[PDB]
């Protein structure tokens, strides 16, 4: 399901997002990462709902870790397996790191406020 | 909104030059009549001044850029907002039932950086239960979400 011939492909692309080894990228630039990737690994647009459930954690600034990404992007695939798990060991042995959020997180706050501001036209509309 | 790219940035100011041809940083409604006449529109004098109004933010009877800004991407927000919605409902809706719970609002919502609590919840449902069922399906969460 999966190889180096593939590893390479993340690696590289990867570099054109953070070629400074920031080892971390924007969360905005995700969609255009997924995208930038190739098969299998790969989750073409519209992928934002996709990314957001993943569920990845964010430090500061809402940056994402390389492999917190390589994780969740390998599971989307060979899915919650035992294969899987071996694999999560191997490359993860191939810093300042404190995840504050996650996009799961994120997208709660965003609906609230959404909610919340919707509300409040309508909180005073209904007082004549 | 500041989700807006810069390729998007420059697209907006493409057209707020359009506009301001005097390069001066604002649209009068003066510049905003000569741009609709060359286009083959004839609006009046009053008709333009809402036009500047309705976009000016801070009275002073211009539009700079950032406020046309504000204005474009409340535009963009607004041909999603159909869908925004849905993809809203089903964040709260996470058993997939089609009915939102009051366990399913508490589960998602925030406010001053903290929970609500039961009664905050308990209302939220009461207000926006047209059928009375204690839940809120599509519809009703449509009501209570448009304008
Ligand atoms: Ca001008
Ligand atoms: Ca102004
Ligand atoms: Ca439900
Ligand atoms: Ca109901």
Known sequence: ?128 | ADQLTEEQIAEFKEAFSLFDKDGDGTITTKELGTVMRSLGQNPTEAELQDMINEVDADGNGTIDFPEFLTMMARKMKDTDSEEEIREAFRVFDKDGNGYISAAELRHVMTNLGEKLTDEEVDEMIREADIDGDGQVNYEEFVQMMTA
């Not at chain 1, 870790?65 to 899987?84: N, P, Q, W, Y």
Request: charged share 30%; with cysteine.
């Open chain 1, 1 to 128: 399901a999966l190889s180096e011939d593939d590893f390479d492909m993340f690696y590289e692309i990867w570099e054109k997002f953070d070629p400074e080894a920031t080892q971390f990228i924007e969360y905005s630039v995700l969609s255009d990462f997924a995208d930038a990737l190739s098969e299998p690994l790969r989750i073409a647009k519209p992928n934002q709902i996709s990314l957001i459930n993943m569920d990845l954690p964010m430090v500061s600034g809402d940056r994402i870790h390389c492999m917190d990404i390589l994780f969740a992007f390998t599971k989307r695939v060979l899915g919650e397996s035992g294969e899987m798990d071996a694999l999560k060991i191997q490359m993860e042995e191939k810093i300042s790191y404190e995840p504050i959020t996650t996009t799961l997180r994120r997208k709660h706050e965003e609906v609230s406020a959404m909610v919340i501001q919707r509300a409040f036209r309508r909180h005073l509309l209904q007082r004549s």
